[PDB]
Amino acid sequence: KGGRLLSVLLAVNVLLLACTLISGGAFNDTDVFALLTTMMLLAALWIVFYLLRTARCPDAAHAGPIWLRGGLVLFGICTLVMDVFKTGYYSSFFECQSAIKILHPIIQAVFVIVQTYFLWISAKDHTHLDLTRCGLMFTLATNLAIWMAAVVDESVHQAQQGYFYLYPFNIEYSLFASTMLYVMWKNVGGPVLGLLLFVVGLAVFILYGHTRQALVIYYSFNIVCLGLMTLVSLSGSVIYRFDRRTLDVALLMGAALGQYAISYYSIVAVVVGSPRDLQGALNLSHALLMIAQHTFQNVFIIESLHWRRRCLKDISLFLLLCNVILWIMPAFGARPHFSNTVEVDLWAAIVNICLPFGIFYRMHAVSSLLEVYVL
Amino acid sequence: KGGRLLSVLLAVNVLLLACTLISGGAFNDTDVFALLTTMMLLAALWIVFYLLRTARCPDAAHAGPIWLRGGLVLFGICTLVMDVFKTGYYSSFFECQSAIKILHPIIQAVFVIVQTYFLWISAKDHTHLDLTRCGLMFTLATNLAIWMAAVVDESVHQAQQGYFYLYPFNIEYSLFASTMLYVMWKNVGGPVLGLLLFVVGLAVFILYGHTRQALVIYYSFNIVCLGLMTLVSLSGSVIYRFDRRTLDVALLMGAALGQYAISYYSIVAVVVGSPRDLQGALNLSHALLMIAQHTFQNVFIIESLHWRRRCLKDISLFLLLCNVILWIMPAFGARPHFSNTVEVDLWAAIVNICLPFGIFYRMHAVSSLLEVYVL
């Protein structure tokens, strides 16, 4: 109402202007970086304004769980490293007069630091409601603009001193910061089975020209990973009948779209291509199990958030480490993986949009499972 | 909760499977039409099941305004004509054994008829909550799947007896049916200035190789069209200070994204191209006025839905016909219009996604303005 409604119009207009200019390169345009820098400083200038204006603010579950801030800080450090490498390679290829190109790393780092500190300190459950509402939503647009900026950049990344140390963790940072700003804007007025999966999950990462068996080892572990989660979550779904947070549900269901799309694109490619090798069947089973475990785990968490009881503790403990080993490969891995052969045929654009949502989903899942385990 | 939550997972899975298969042609795939037909019949089979199961239902502003059903029926008739032309040209080029190609028109027509009648009769503000919730959301997926099917089809339409009578009104039908199903799912448990614009708006449509003045006449009328709306809505915004529905706001703001994106893409193209002719300045002014009038009208409607008073009656009356003449050109016109020259350079894909939202926005606007005028 009023300023609250006006802020969204300001947010979408900044976003829509950015989104149009994000795809400037495909139109056959480096002016996007200048726009990206401009919104970063102004958002940062509001943050530093707020960091001293927060004294005026008569502040006051709702404060935001620890995992949010932890992931925020971690991915902020990752963005710091990313922009350090960026400015390093820019200074290595120092020739063009354009400065916005080298300013974007520095301004991005400054923005990351100030936003991280501000979100860390003020996430706890005021005054200047007109400016703050227009301030938080403007910062929301900046995170989404740089997110879609990075998505396009790595999508077209295919085809000297930076050693191509690309870190898509900035995308994960933008989503983590966006939800943290969202919640603040809303209040303006024997489980040892998972342990064995840690070693084998890391061993294949250490292990990974590839052999036919190497694909099987990677897929078989993944298949038995989701296959176990498909039935323990189903086991958790049937035991809840014995013992019978809007944004949490939206984030859980919403982030699941990332894994749904890649799996659905995988099964479509598998059936259309109709391969005869075991690789196609492995892909089909892996994607189907991914979708099934995602749906069942989502239902389990949604129902949960609304001796004997130790049974549900073990599976939640089991899925806790099982999810973590499922997050290592996306966070640290290769998007054009050898696992997908018929899908890459390049589909990296689909992977870039989708994988961070799965990474986002994993962090929400483990925190939710930990939340009900201690309860 | 429970079946209500399970339905959305069913809806998105059908949608996501469809969305992946919607873009099958670009992957270098007519199996999408078979999938489109399959979900249509099953959704239709639920409708005819519901049309006799509604007797069991103990039914009971919330019933849905008249404009929704009216647009639904109109665009359903348009879809009937479209599929009639489709099956006609298919029977004209009758050679391939594939039947799904010719079945899709007939099944689409049957689905349109049954869905139109069902939405017309049961939109009024039960039993079988498990099936109905999974039924409405399944129908929601079918409308969105065919919407994105049509969007891609006309996007790639560029480059004998059907005479290419393409009717994008099916897209408008899908959005109209989707919101009608959405609201049902939520409740499971001197203004003569506009008159002059009618003639000039139709005259240019009758008038429209083109001349330089022809572009000016088309743009000047559009500029003075929005320019008047930019200040009367502003006039309506300042008089509301003298005299000081969630889904309505979302639809109004959400449908505005269509006109925002094309205008924002226009201004980006205008400034980047930097043309010297009056055409570029006309485009820039037209798009800026579009964005400004959209924002101001949205704010005016949002505030409104929450002698002397005759002043706001006239402007709402003025915008009533002013919006209508602004809906004729998108509903009946050419997407690669001569107005955009630097933008087409082909950007028809952007136009196809965006214009129906403006058409949707216009219908919501006129109904809302009529709603407050009678009040």
Q: Is the same domain home to A287 and A201?
A: yes
Nearest CA of chain A to the CA of B17: how many Å? 6
Helices marked H in chain A:
3-22, 31-53, 66-92, 100-122, 129-155, 169-186, 193-207, 212-239, 246-273, 278-305, 310-331, 348-374
How far is A26 from A149, CA to CA, in rounded Å? 12
How far is A34 from A42, CA to CA, in rounded Å? 12
Domain C-terminal end among A186, A203, A219: A186
Named by the residue before each, gaps in chain B exceeding 2.5 A from C to N are 28, 60, 125, 159, 189, 208, 244, 306, 345
Q: Is the same domain home to B224 and B164?
A: no
Domain C-terminal end among A186, A211, A226: A186
> Are A330 and A365 contacting, i.e. CB atoms less than 8 angstroms apart?
no
Domain range enclosing A370: 193-374
Q: Which residue, among B362, B275, B274, has the nearest Cα to B326 in the 3D structure?
A: B362
Residues of chain B whose C-beta is under 8 A from some C-beta in A?
A: 1, 5-6, 8-9, 12-13, 16-17, 19-21, 24, 27, 29, 31, 249, 253, 257, 260-261, 264-265, 268-269, 272, 291, 295, 298-299, 302, 306
Kindly determine whether residue A299 and residue B17, on different chains, have CB atoms separated by under 8 Å.
no
Q: Is the same domain home to A64 and A199?
A: no
In the DSSP assignment, the letter for residue A97 is S
> How far, rounded to the nearest angstrom, does the alpha carbon of residue B309 sit from its chain's CA centroid?
32
How far is A264 from A313, CA to CA, in rounded Å? 31
Letter string b/e over residues B95-126, b meaning 16 or more CB atoms within 10 A of that residue's CB: eeeeebbebbbebbbbbbbbbbebbbebbeeb
Kindly determine whether residue A257 and residue B306, on different chains, have CB atoms separated by under 8 Å.
no
> Are A367 and A65 contacting, i.e. CB atoms less than 8 angstroms apart?
yes
Q: Would you state the torsion angle of the CA atoms of residues A170, A172, A177, A179, taken in this order, to the nearest 10 degrees?
A: 160
> Are A342 and A274 contacting, i.e. CB atoms less than 8 angstroms apart?
no
Kindly determine whether residue A261 and residue B306, on different chains, have CB atoms separated by under 8 Å.
no
Question: In Å, how far are A259, B48, B99 from B73, measured between CA atoms?
Answer: 38, 18, 28
**What's the one-letter identity of residue A136?**
L
> Are A259 and A358 contacting, i.e. CB atoms less than 8 angstroms apart?
yes
How far is A203 from A220, CA to CA, in rounded Å? 14
Q: Which residue, among B290, B291, B279, has the nearest Cα to B344 in the 3D structure?
A: B279
Q: Is the same domain home to B276 and B131?
A: no
In the DSSP assignment, the letter for residue B205 is H
Domain count, chain B: 2
**Start-to-end Cα distance in chain B:** 38
> Are B194 and B325 contacting, i.e. CB atoms less than 8 angstroms apart?
yes
Residue B37: CB atoms within 10 Å: 20
Cβ neighbours of B272 in A, within 8 Å: 24, 27, 29, 31
How far is A172 from A67, CA to CA, in rounded Å? 13
How far is B103 from B111, CA to CA, in rounded Å? 12
How far is B356 from B359, CA to CA, in rounded Å? 5
Cβ neighbours of A24 in B, within 8 Å: 268, 272
Q: Which residues 6+ apart lie within 8 Å of B293 measured at CB?
A: B226, B229, B230, B233
Kindly determine whether residue A261 and residue B6, on different chains, have CB atoms separated by under 8 Å.
no
In the DSSP assignment, the letter for residue B25 is G
Q: What does chain B come to in residues?
A: 375
Residue tagged 């897929």 (tokens):
A219
- Transcribe A112-171 into DSSP letters: HHHHHHHHHHH------HHHHHHHHHHHHHHHHHHHHHHHHHHHS-----STT---THHH
> Are A22 and A32 contacting, i.e. CB atoms less than 8 angstroms apart?
yes
Name the residue of chain B whose CA is nearest to A6's CA.
B299
Domain C-terminal end among A160, A186, A212: A186
How far is B61 from B68, CA to CA, in rounded Å? 12
Residue tagged 């979550």 (tokens):
A233
Q: Which residue, among B222, B301, B340, B236, has the nearest Cα to A9 in the 3D structure?
A: B301
How far is B371 from B375, CA to CA, in rounded Å? 7
Q: Which residues 6+ apart lie within 8 Å of B330 measured at CB?
A: B355, B356, B358, B359, B362
Q: Is the same domain home to A244 and A137?
A: no
Enter the resolution in angstroms: 3.8
Q: Closest partner residue to B295 among A9, A27, A265, by Cβ?
A: A9
Q: Which residue, among A74, A150, A72, has the nearest Cα to A105 in the 3D structure?
A: A150
Q: What angle do CA B284, B288, B291 make, to 5 degrees?
A: 145
Residue tagged 């995170």 (tokens):
A143
> Dihedral of CA B217/B223/B229/B232: which sign?
negative
Q: Is the same domain home to A129 and A245?
A: no
Token digits for B272?
């980047």
Nearest CA of chain A to the CA of B269: how many Å? 9
How far is A38 from A178, CA to CA, in rounded Å? 18
Q: Closest partner residue to B20 among A1, A12, A261, by Cβ?
A: A261
> Are B369 and B357 contacting, i.e. CB atoms less than 8 angstroms apart?
no
> Are A46 and A7 contacting, i.e. CB atoms less than 8 angstroms apart?
no
Q: Is the same domain home to B366 and B221?
A: yes
Q: Closest partner residue to B260 among A16, A260, A268, by Cβ?
A: A16
Q: Is the same domain home to A104 and A243?
A: no
Kindly determine whether residue A9 and residue B291, on different chains, have CB atoms separated by under 8 Å.
no
- Transcribe B311-354 into DSSP letters: HHHHHHHHHHHHHHHHHHHHHSS-SS-SS-STTT---HHHHHHH
Q: Would you state the torsion angle of the CA atoms of residues A330, A332, A336, A340, taken in this order, to the nearest 10 degrees?
A: -50
Tell which phi-psi region holds residue A179, choosing left (phi > 0), alpha (psi between -120 and 50) or beta.
alpha
Kindly determine whether residue B264 and residue A16, on different chains, have CB atoms separated by under 8 Å.
yes
> Are B365 and B319 contacting, i.e. CB atoms less than 8 angstroms apart?
yes
Cβ neighbours of B29 in A, within 8 Å: 272
Q: Is the same domain home to A200 and A304?
A: yes
Q: Closest partner residue to B20 among A5, A253, A268, by Cβ?
A: A268
Question: In Å, how far are A71, B223, B253 from B227, measured between CA atoms?
Answer: 48, 6, 20
> Are B165 and B189 contacting, i.e. CB atoms less than 8 angstroms apart?
no
How far is B67 from B48, CA to CA, in rounded Å? 25
Residue tagged 């226009």 (tokens):
B266
**What's the one-letter identity of residue A12?**
V
How far is B373 from B375, CA to CA, in rounded Å? 5
Q: Is the same domain home to A354 and A249?
A: yes
The three-state secondary structure class of B30 is coil
> Are A51 and A114 contacting, i.e. CB atoms less than 8 angstroms apart?
yes
Q: What are phi and psi of A240, to 5 degrees?
A: -70, -25
**CB-side exposure of A225: number of CA atoms within 13 Å?**
28
How far is B71 from B49, CA to CA, in rounded Å? 25
Question: In Å, how far are A90, A101, A104, A109, B292 from A96, measured between CA atoms?
Answer: 10, 9, 15, 22, 38
Nearest CA of chain A to the CA of B334: how many Å? 22
**What's the one-letter identity of residue B99?**
A
Token digits for A223?
């298949």
> How far, rounded to the nearest angstrom, does the alpha carbon of residue B315 sit from its chain's CA centroid?
24
Question: In Å, how far are A50, A65, A152, A296, A321 from A299, measured between CA atoms?
Answer: 39, 21, 33, 5, 19
Q: Closest partner residue to B272 among A29, A298, A299, by Cβ?
A: A29
Cβ neighbours of A27 in B, within 8 Å: 269, 272
A–B CB contacts, 8 A cutoff, strictly below: 70
Max Cα separation, chain B?
A: 70
Q: Is the same domain home to B167 and B139?
A: yes
Kindly determine whether residue A264 and residue B8, on different chains, have CB atoms separated by under 8 Å.
no
Q: Is the same domain home to B146 and B268?
A: no
